[PDB]
Amino acid sequence: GAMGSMERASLIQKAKLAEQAERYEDMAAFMKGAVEKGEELSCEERNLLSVAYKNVVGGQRAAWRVLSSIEQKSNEEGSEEKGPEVREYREKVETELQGVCDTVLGLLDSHLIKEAGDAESRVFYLKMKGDYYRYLAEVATGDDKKRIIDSARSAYQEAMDISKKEMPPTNPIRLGLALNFSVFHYEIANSPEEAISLAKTTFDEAMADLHTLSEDSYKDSTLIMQLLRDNLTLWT
Amino acid sequence: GAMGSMERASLIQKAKLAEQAERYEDMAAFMKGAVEKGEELSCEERNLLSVAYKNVVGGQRAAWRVLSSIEQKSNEEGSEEKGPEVREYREKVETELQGVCDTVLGLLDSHLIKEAGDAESRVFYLKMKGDYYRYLAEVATGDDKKRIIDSARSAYQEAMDISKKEMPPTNPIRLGLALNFSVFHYEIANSPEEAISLAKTTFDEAMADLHTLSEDSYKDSTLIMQLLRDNLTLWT
Amino acid sequence: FPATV
Amino acid sequence: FPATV
Ligand SMILES: *CC(=O)NCC1CCN(C(=O)C2(Nc3ccc(Cl)cc3)CC2)CC1
Ligand SMILES: *CC(=O)NCC1CCN(C(=O)C2(Nc3ccc(Cl)cc3)CC2)CC1
Ligand SMILES: [Mg+2]
Ligand SMILES: [Mg+2]
Ligand SMILES: [Mg+2]
Ligand SMILES: [Mg+2]
Ligand SMILES: [Mg+2]
Ligand SMILES: [Mg+2]
Numbered sequence A, B: 001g002a003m004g005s006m007e008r009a010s011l012i013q014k015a016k017l018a019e020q021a022e023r024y025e026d027m028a029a030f031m032k033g034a035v036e037k038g039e040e041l042s043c044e045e046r047n048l049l050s051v052a053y054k055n056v057v058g059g060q061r062a063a064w065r066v067l068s069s070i071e072q073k074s075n076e077e078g079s080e081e082k083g084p085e086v087r088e089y090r091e092k093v094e095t096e097l098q099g100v101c102d103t104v105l106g107l108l109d110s111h112l113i114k115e116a117g118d119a120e121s122r123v124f125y126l127k128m129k130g131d132y133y134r135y136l137a138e139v140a141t142g143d144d145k146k147r148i149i150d151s152a153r154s155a156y157q158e159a160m161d162i163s164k165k166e167m168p169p170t171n172p173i174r175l176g177l178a179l180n181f182s183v184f185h186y187e188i189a190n191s192p193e194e195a196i197s198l199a200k201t202t203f204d205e206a207m208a209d210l211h212t213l214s215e216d217s218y219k220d221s222t223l224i225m226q227l228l229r230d231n232l233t234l235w236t
Numbered sequence C, D: 001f002p003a004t005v
Helices: A008-020 A024-036 A043-074 A085-115 A119-139 A145-166 A172-187 A192-207 A215-235 B008-020 B024-036 B043-074 B085-115 B119-139 B145-166 B172-187 B192-207 B215-235
Strands: none
Touching: A008 A024, A008 A043, A008 B043, A008 B085, A024 A043, A024 A085, A043 A085, A043 A119, A043 B008, A085 A119, A085 B008, A119 A145, A119 A172, A145 A172, A172 A192, A172 A215, A192 A215, B008 B024, B008 B043, B024 B043, B024 B085, B043 B085, B043 B119, B085 B119, B119 B145, B119 B172, B145 B172, B172 B192, B172 B215, B192 B215
């Protein structure tokens, strides 16, 4: 709680400045402080939280993939032994990544999810929970890999169940959840057919509801629908 | 000395991995550890050190400029008072930047410069000293601004004097020093004529010596000559 | 790598 | 902003 002495509003203000400066580690720390004030987050604030950590972990995942590739190549036949350094440094990055994931999951568990009653907030947080378990699953190789995968699945499934009951098929949160759960199926759960079915059905049901929307809502929904299409194109 | 327990060679290996992963903070920490082993650095190692810190401080400078611009706008007539947060966050970034500069200057002073006897090493380190005082000067607004500027000038001037005596006019280190000292003149010392003269003379003397070079040396030298031309174009 | 948001 | 190396 290094941010314990800073006003909630000041933390939010600084998170926005940090975003403008592309200082995503700072942005995440500010938003962690804001969450730890204990008040619920507004929509704008939830998006600041998600953007900050997505950017931090996104960078860690990209670095982890570079290092894992180098490590895999070192373990091929005819590769000269270079010692423990590649594994050590991949492990260092991995540990830092896991730490960030644990931090986010911690904020969600203490106490964002339990206080979130509106569908838009609850689905958003449960999607985040699925996402950060998914990132843990990407690097998991041990006894708990199955349980980590199941934790992601469970969180996404709860979010899906609420979204289908409470939100229109074009709702950007419902769409983004479906996009990410579809990727979970393809990349984590070894279920490409489920991934493809989910993406297709989500796209088609959104298409059918676009007629209800304003120009601005149409823009928001079609943006994510295009991501669904992009993934379908990659996979088929 | 968190890196005190790691082998020099392992730190160098990891700095290279960190570069590949675009983990420049890690790269800099590894290289700091390597310097602190107390042995002189090879050419390749000097370049790893410089690349790491250039990238770290480069990011801090870009963030500082974003925040300083927002702060300047807040102090214009008709700007609504938003409280101390912009200044505080600019100050935070500034302090971190100054810390990095102080770290680099510290490595140079203890004891890279004093052990560097060959022109290529000595000029390279003195150029770095000029560069990190220049970064300090960019953010300086107080009693010591003049002395900081003079520290940059002195370091660059020593490097220039050695480079002119000991290196051919096409030597990439001599060229890069001249490029950066020219920018110092333009941006820090309020001496655009000196900046332009230096860039022009450096370019023209390099042009006249290209005939002596191999294809690969020609590529290296012409790359930096083009940067001199680019700056001349910006300034004229 | 596939798109996520 | 001008070029430096
Ligand atoms: C509070 C709230 O409504 N947040 C969701 C908005 C919806 C629009 N939007 C986007 O399209 C992008 N980001 C996300 C993030 C999460 C989810 Cl579940 C969907 C979309 C920018 C793509 C911003 C956030
Ligand atoms: C040990 C050594 O010779 N280092 C210098 C090399 C020269 C070629 N080079 C470049 O052109 C770039 N970087 C720099 C860095 C510092 C200076 Cl003074 C000049 C050029 C990549 C542009 C790599 C370093
Ligand atoms: Mg308060
Ligand atoms: Mg591990
Ligand atoms: Mg289903
Ligand atoms: Mg040793
Ligand atoms: Mg200050
Ligand atoms: Mg002169």
